[PDB]
């Protein structure tokens, strides 16, 4: 559960993200692939060389989805509905990996938004990532 302060803090931070959502989403995935090498097991069909059109396309897709999630923060379940089925029925990514991706997004954001990334926004984002991951995972079994 995201408090109203939470959503205010998410809506604000993400706003700053704005147009870099795509690029921050690629950097996040490059961050995860590097720190947590096991996440790779899910993209053996990607060229994971830095800058690959694939990682760039993927990061873009991931960000849209987050923004979709920010835009519909009061009804994430319904909004990520399709993503949820995809994750649970096809991709079937172990739920722990979400947590690693969350952490990498949080570091991407920390590094891009010096001004906005206060103790609070930080708290709120993390909760937000926690919620997004819960939703994408909710239809697992």
């Amino acid at each position: 559960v995201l408090s109203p302060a939470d959503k205010t803090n998410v809506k604000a931070a993400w706003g700053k993200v704005g147009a870099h959502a795509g690029e921050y989403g690629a950097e996040a995935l490059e961050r995860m692939f590097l720190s947590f090498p096991t996440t790779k097991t899910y993209f053996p069909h990607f060229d994971l060389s830095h800058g690959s059109a694939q990682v760039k396309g993927h990061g873009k897709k991931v960000a849209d989805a987050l923004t979709n999630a920010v835009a519909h923060v009061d009804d994430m379940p319904n909004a990520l509905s399709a993503l949820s089925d995809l994750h649970a029925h096809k991709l079937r990514v172990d739920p722990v990996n979400f947590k690693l991706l969350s952490h990498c997004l949080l570091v991407t954001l920390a590094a891009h938004l010096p001004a906005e990334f206060t103790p609070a926004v930080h708290a709120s984002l993390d909760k937000f990532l926690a919620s997004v991951s819960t939703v994408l995972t909710s239809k697992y079994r």
Binding site: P37, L91, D94, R141
Partner: protein, 146 residues
């Protein structure tokens, strides 16, 4: 891993009791049912749609025996879990693309199947000795990921 004399003997004793053939097919079977996402590595296995389908599945059965067969050989080299598994570790990573987290899952499911098979013989202290082995085997298999 490091196990006390008491823990090593708990492990060994109980394991000599285990019929790998069928404890493996159960462990794998149960993995596929409790953590359905693990089903991704076994599309060629036929029908996995129902617990019944998964438990009665012969490829699952065949595979479980194999996995556990290996698991068994590790028990014998408890001292150097890493050396033992590197080849399978490498295979698991490079050709199979199996997230190491699936090793932890199976390990936990193995413990449940043990407790279930042996009931009360599988005591707390026995459980613990067996938790350190599973953890050690999982790290042994995750060891060569890159």
């Amino acid at each position: 891993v490091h196990l006390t004399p008491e823990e090593k003997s708990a492990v060994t004793a109980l394991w000599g009791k285990v019929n790998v053939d069928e404890v493996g097919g159960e462990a794998l079977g149960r993995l596929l049912v409790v953590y359905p996402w693990t089903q991704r590595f076994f599309e060629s296995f036929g029908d996995l749609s129902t617990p019944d389908a998964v438990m009665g599945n012969p490829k699952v059965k065949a595979h479980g025996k194999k996995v556990l067969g290996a698991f068994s050989d590790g028990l014998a080299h408890l001292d150097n879990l890493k050396g033992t598994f590197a080849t399978l570790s490498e295979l698991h990573c490079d050709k199979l693309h199996v997230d190491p987290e699936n090793f932890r899952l199976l390990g936990n499911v193995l413990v449940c199947v043990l407790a279930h098979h042996f009931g009360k013989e599988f005591t707390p202290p026995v459980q613990a000795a067996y938790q350190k082995v599973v953890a050690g085997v999982a790290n042994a298999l995750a060891h060569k990921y890159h």
